[PDB]
């Protein structure tokens, strides 16, 4: 893991705030886990720009042709 | 030496004057006290800490007057060669405050 | 997937110990000719020694550097009951105040993590571990005597806990070297209550009986548990998850192999706490790592 | 060589002096103006055209670069006006007019003392302006200096302090001065070997030889060299170099005090050099 962290830092991993999901293309080759986080973060971010979205779906669908 | 100063050579004036027989507030990170020197007097520790390098500075340095962050001279020389922000994320364009 | 190579350092006597600073740019080498040397690493990559001096009467077992935030300081240990603190002035390595206050020979010398001062942890063969403190960082000539530890056994190896959180007090591990048939213990763990400034006993690994030669804690890196290495005839990696007097650690055992068929001398971790190198008296050494199933497996013996 | 420069002024030129480095050139004139050029590589460029000083200007004097870019400029209007260079622009900084008659001579003091400017007017007084800090000037006067009035002043080189300058005026006597421990500018001596009127006086720079040399110039025309090498005897022996046929105006030393240049009413400039035998020959 230490070797991977070295190549991640050299390729400016994590600092692209314009488009978020493009980070998973900078992480390396393929990781289903790491290609799921950024997509899960991109959809959350582009809804406060158009605060409770960060709470997760559990709090959303607990206090509750669809609602 | 005065003649050499008139001509325009300042290194060779110092070299000559070196042979004359007769002679001619950094905050600490452990106790937050005004210490004048490279070593503290209360906790007896290093007071200056490089803002790029985090190895204690005992020799030459430079810093911004308002932000008060600086370190080894070559370190800031490389850093400020291409950017314009305080390296410790302070928000000052020290190039406009350090240089009058 | 490790590819071995060779270096271009030429010596005269044997080599007993080596150590790396913090940045992996300098190292200190021992030699059974009453001499120690340090080498820099040129930008091109070629090494070149830049120091050599006799330091004691006999042989020097260990040299360990210090954290650079206190300059460039070394710490050597010798057979003839001594433990000194070297410094550097620039060049010439003028020795600071050597301090020997033991009776037997000192077994090992290791520094302390940088987050609590400039402590030092000499231990001797008789079973006395001594703690030195220097609250005069501007001048490293004065050393006090904080709490010493008595265990009434033999001491071979010492190890600290590199954890830096404010939720874990410092801990000391101690290794024996005795071959006595009284097989009771071989590795104890000490702790530190802040309310008494003493050193109690935390636990005891009543699962290793053969002589132990080296103990190396694994770096923390934020995990919720700690890891130790025990260099017996079998290489062993334990595990303690603190439960919620001293704290009650619940031990385990996660690996025990013997694919070296020799006397496993020393073990030490890497910077990131995943790969662990193990040595022995069988010619060439092995590298251990953890796989996807969290079941440690060999990784490239060479 | 030569570095010909056209002044582009409307009247006569009364003084001209260069900087401490060899890069700038100030010019006084009779059009109530002071033009600062930039004489580098022959360039006749302009940097300033400072105006004011109602009368005709007579003299200028640059200050030591260690204190920044300053320039003193006296004139007929009985006002000394002082300039600086802030943000690359030349501006009027301070004016002082504590003189009944025209101020004739200005001379900066040696930099070891500090920043003192000595101005001697035609009303028989010397005004010394000391820079007190924070843009403040202290003025100490010496009333009843000469019978008619001072014409020129000069400052002696600093030795190991005792401040000391030398003034001359229309009474045909050269006077010496010294600052007491309290601050009283007590007179020390007076020299009398001239006939008509002394116009300019100049004190030689020192390079360590135990010998003080002062030149002088008279209206009838006589350059007298006042050597004095008696250490602490305070005795001066006049000599002579020539007797011209006009009014001798100005005398200037070299940096090593081996060549003297004398200019007078004859509309010509002469150079001189002391021989091995002790006589002064032209060149
Ligand atoms: Zn302190
Ligand atoms: Zn640094
Ligand atoms: Zn800052
Ligand atoms: Zn700043």
Swiss-Prot record, chain A:
Task performed by this protein: As a component of the GATOR2 complex, functions as an activator of the amino acid-sensing branch of the mTORC1 signaling pathway. The GATOR2 complex indirectly activates mTORC1 through the inhibition of the GATOR1 subcomplex. GATOR2 probably acts as an E3 ubiquitin-protein ligase toward GATOR1. In the presence of abundant amino acids, the GATOR2 complex mediates ubiquitination of the NPRL2 core component of the GATOR1 complex, leading to GATOR1 inactivation. In the absence of amino acids, GATOR2 is inhibited, activating the GATOR1 complex.
Record's subcellular location: Lysosome membrane
Residue windows of the WD repeats: 6-48
Entry superkingdom: Eukaryota
Taxon lineage: Eukaryota, Metazoa, Chordata, Craniata, Vertebrata
Species in which this protein is naturally found: Homo sapiens
Included stretch of the parent chain: 390 to 487 of 875
Known partners and oligomeric status: Component of the GATOR2 subcomplex, composed of MIOS, SEC13, SEH1L, WDR24 and WDR59. The GATOR2 complex interacts with CASTOR1 and CASTOR2; the interaction is negatively regulated by arginine. CASTOR1 and CASTOR2 convey leucine availability via direct interaction with MIOS. The GATOR2 complex interacts with SESN1, SESN2 and SESN3; the interaction is negatively regulated by amino acids.
Name the UniProt record assigns to this protein: GATOR2 complex protein MIOS
Family statement drawn from the similarity comment of this UniProt entry: Belongs to the WD repeat mio family.
Gene for this chain: MIOS
Swiss-Prot record, chain B:
Binding site for Zn(2+) 1: 28, 31, 40, 43
Assembly and oligomerization: Component of the GATOR2 subcomplex, composed of MIOS, SEC13, SEH1L, WDR24 and WDR59. The GATOR2 complex interacts with CASTOR1 and CASTOR2; the interaction is negatively regulated by arginine. The GATOR2 complex interacts with SESN1, SESN2 and SESN3; the interaction is negatively regulated by amino acids. Interacts with DDB1-CUL4A/B E3 ligase complexes.
Chain coiled-coil ranges: none
Protein name as annotated: GATOR2 complex protein WDR59
Family of this protein: Belongs to the WD repeat WDR59 family.
Subcellular location: Lysosome membrane
Function: As a component of the GATOR2 complex, functions as an activator of the amino acid-sensing branch of the mTORC1 signaling pathway. The GATOR2 complex indirectly activates mTORC1 through the inhibition of the GATOR1 subcomplex. GATOR2 probably acts as an E3 ubiquitin-protein ligase toward GATOR1. In the presence of abundant amino acids, the GATOR2 complex mediates ubiquitination of the NPRL2 core component of the GATOR1 complex, leading to GATOR1 inactivation. In the absence of amino acids, GATOR2 is inhibited, activating the GATOR1 complex.
Native source species: Homo sapiens
RING-type Zn finger ranges: 47-99
ZnF (C4-type) residues: 27-46
Superkingdom of source: Eukaryota
Residues that coordinate or bind Zn(2+) 2: 53, 72, 75
Residues of the full protein shown: 867 to 974 of 974
Record-listed Zn(2+) 4 binding positions: 69, 86, 90
Protein residues bound to Zn(2+) 3: 64, 92, 94
UniProtKB/Swiss-Prot annotation, chain C:
Glycyl lysine isopeptide (Lys-Gly) (interchain with G-Cter in SUMO2) cross-link site: 12
Keywords: Cell cycle, Cell division, Centromere, Chromosome, Chromosome partition, Isopeptide bond, Kinetochore, Lysosome, Membrane, Mitosis, mRNA transport, Nuclear pore complex, Nucleus, Phosphoprotein, Protein transport, Repeat, Translocation, Transport, Ubl conjugation, WD repeat
Record's keyword annotation contains Signal: no
Gene3D superfamilies for this protein: YVTN repeat-like/Quinoprotein amine dehydrogenase (2.130.10.10)
Annotated WD repeat ranges: 10-49, 55-90, 101-142, 150-200, 207-244, 259-298
Modification Phosphoserine, positions: 169, 180
Localisation: Chromosome, Centromere, Kinetochore; Nucleus, Nuclear pore complex; Lysosome membrane
GO molecular function, one term: structural molecule activity
Highest taxon listed in the record's lineage: Eukaryota
GO biological process annotation, one example: cell division
Gene Ontology cellular component annotations, sorted alphabetically: cytosol; GATOR2 complex; kinetochore; lysosomal membrane; nuclear envelope; nuclear pore; nuclear pore outer ring; Seh1-associated complex
Activity regulation statement: The GATOR2 complex is negatively regulated by the upstream amino acid sensors CASTOR1 and SESN2, which sequester the GATOR2 complex in absence of amino acids. In the presence of abundant amino acids, GATOR2 is released from CASTOR1 and SESN2 and activated.
A Pfam family per the record: WD40
Family recorded in the similarity comment: Belongs to the WD repeat SEC13 family.
PANTHER family assigned to the protein according to its UniProt record, in alphabetical order: NUCLEAR PORE COMPLEX PROTEIN SEC13 / SEH1 FAMILY MEMBER (PTHR11024), NUCLEOPORIN SEH1 (PTHR11024:SF3)
Descriptive protein name: Nucleoporin SEH1
From Swiss-Prot, chain D:
GO BP annotation list: cellular response to nutrient levels; COPII-coated vesicle budding; COPII-coated vesicle cargo loading; intracellular protein transport; mRNA transport; negative regulation of TORC1 signaling; nucleocytoplasmic transport; positive regulation of TOR signaling
Domain of life the protein comes from: Eukaryota
Positions carrying Phosphoserine: 167
A single cellular component GO annotation: intracellular membrane-bounded organelle
GO MF terms, alphabetically ordered: identical protein binding; structural molecule activity
Segments annotated as WD repeats: 8-47, 52-93, 98-141, 145-187, 193-236, 243-282
Localization: Cytoplasmic vesicle, COPII-coated vesicle membrane; Endoplasmic reticulum membrane; Nucleus, Nuclear pore complex; Lysosome membrane
Sorted UniProt keywords: Acetylation, Cytoplasmic vesicle, Endoplasmic reticulum, ER-Golgi transport, Lysosome, Membrane, mRNA transport, Nuclear pore complex, Nucleus, Phosphoprotein, Protein transport, Repeat, Translocation, Transport, WD repeat
Keyword Membrane: yes
Keyword Hydrolase: no
Main location (coarse class): membrane
UniProt topology in membrane: Peripheral membrane protein
Summary of activators and inhibitors of this protein: The GATOR2 complex is negatively regulated by the upstream amino acid sensors CASTOR1 and SESN2, which sequester the GATOR2 complex in absence of amino acids. In the presence of abundant amino acids, GATOR2 is released from CASTOR1 and SESN2 and activated.
Family: Belongs to the WD repeat SEC13 family.
PANTHER family hit by this protein: NUCLEAR PORE COMPLEX PROTEIN SEC13 / SEH1 FAMILY MEMBER (PTHR11024), PROTEIN SEC13 HOMOLOG (PTHR11024:SF2)
Protein name: Protein SEC13 homolog
Species this protein is from: Homo sapiens (Human)
């Amino acid at each position: 893991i230490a070797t991977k962290m070295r190549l991640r830092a050299l390729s400016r991993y994590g600092l692209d705030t314009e488009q978020v999901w493009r980070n998973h293309i900078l992480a390396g080759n393929e990781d289903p886990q790491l290609k799921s986080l950024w997509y899960t973060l991109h959809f959350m971010k582009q809804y406060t720009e158009d605060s409770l979205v960060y709470a997760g779906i559990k709090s959303i669908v607990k206090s509750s042709n669809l609602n | 030496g005065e003649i050499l100063y008139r001509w325009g050579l300042r290194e060779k004036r110092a070299e000559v004057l070196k042979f004359v027989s007769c002679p001619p507030g950094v905050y600490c990170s452990h106790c937050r006290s005004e210490v004048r020197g490279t070593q503290c007097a209360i906790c007896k520790g290093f007071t200056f800490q490089c803002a790029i390098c985090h190895v204690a500075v005992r020799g030459s340095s430079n810093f911004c007057l308002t932000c008060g962050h600086g370190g080894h001279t070559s370190h800031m020389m490389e850093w400020f060669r291409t950017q314009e922000v305080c390296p410790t994320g302070c928000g000052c364009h020290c190039l406009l405050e350090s240089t009058f | 997937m490790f590819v071995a190579r060779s270096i271009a350092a030429d010596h005269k006597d044997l080599i007993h110990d080596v150590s790396f600073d913090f940045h992996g740019r300098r190292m200190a080498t021992c030699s059974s000719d009453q001499s120690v040397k340090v080498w820099d690493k040129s930008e091109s990559g070629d090494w070149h020694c830049t120091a050599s001096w006799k330091t004691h009467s006999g042989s020097v077992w260990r040299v360990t550097w210090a954290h650079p935030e206190f300059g460039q300081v070394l710490a050597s240990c010798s057979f003839d009951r001594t433990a000194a603190v070297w410094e550097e002035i620039v060049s010439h390595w003028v020795k600071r105040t050597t301090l020997v206050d033991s009776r037997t020979s000192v077994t090992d010398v290791k520094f302390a993590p940088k987050h609590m001062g400039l402590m030092l942890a000499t231990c001797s063969a008789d079973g006395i571990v001594r703690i030195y403190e220097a609250p005069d960082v501007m001048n490293l000539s004065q050393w006090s005597l904080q709490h010493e530890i008595s265990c009434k056994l033999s001491c071979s190896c010492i190890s600290w806990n590199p954890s830096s959180s404010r939720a874990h007090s410092p801990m000391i591990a101690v290794g024996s070297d005795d071959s006595s048939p009284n097989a009771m213990a071989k590795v104890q763990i000490f702790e530190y209550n802040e309310n008494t400034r003493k050193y109690a006993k935390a636990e005891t690994l009543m699962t290793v009986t053969d002589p132990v030669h080296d103990i190396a804690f694994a770096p923390n890196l934020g995990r919720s548990f700690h890891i130790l290495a025990i260099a017996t005839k079998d290489v062993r990696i334990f595990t303690l998850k603190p439960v919620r007097g001293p704290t009650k650690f619940e031990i385990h055992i996660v690996a025990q192999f013997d694919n070296h068929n020799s006397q496993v001398w020393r073990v030490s971790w890497n910077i990131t706490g995943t790969v662990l190198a193990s040595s022995g008296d069988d010619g060439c050494v092995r590298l251990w790592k953890a796989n996807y199933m969290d079941n440690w497996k060999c990784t490239g013996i060479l | 060589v030569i570095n010909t420069v056209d002044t582009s002024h409307e009247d006569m030129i009364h003084d001209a002096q260069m900087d401490y480095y060899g890069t700038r050139l100030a010019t006084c004139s009779s059009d109530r103006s002071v033009k600062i050029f930039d004489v580098r590589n022959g360039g006749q460029i302009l940097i300033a055209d400072l105006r004011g000083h109602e009368g005709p200007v007579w003299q200028v004097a640059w200050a030591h670069p260690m204190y920044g870019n300053i320039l003193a400029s006296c004139s007929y209007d009985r006002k000394v006006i002082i300039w600086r260079e802030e943000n690359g622009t030349w501006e009027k900084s301070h004016e002082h007019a504590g003189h009944d008659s025209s101020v004739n001579s200005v001379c900066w003091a040696p930099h070891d003392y500090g920043l003192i400017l000595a101005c001697g007017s035609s009303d028989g007084a010397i005004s010394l302006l000391t820079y007190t800090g924070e843009g403040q000037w202290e003025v100490k006067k010496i009333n009843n200096a000469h019978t008619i009035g001072c014409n020129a002043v000069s400052w002696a080189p600093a030795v190991v302090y005792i401040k000391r300058f030398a003034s001359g005026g229309c009474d045909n006597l050269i006077k010496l001065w010294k600052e007491e421990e309290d601050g009283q500018w007590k007179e020390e001596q007076k020299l009398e070997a001239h006939s008509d009127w002394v116009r300019d006086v100049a004190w030689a720079p020192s390079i360590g030889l135990p010998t003080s040399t002062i030149a002088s110039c008279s209206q009838d025309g006589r350059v007298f060299i006042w050597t004095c090498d008696d250490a602490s005897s305070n005795t001066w022996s006049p000599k002579l170099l020539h007797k011209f046929n006009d009014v001798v105006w100005h005398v200037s030393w070299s940096i090593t005090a081996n060549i003297l240049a004398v200019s007078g009413g004859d509309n010509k400039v002469t150079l001189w050099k002391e021989s091995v035998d002790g006589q002064w020959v032209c060149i």
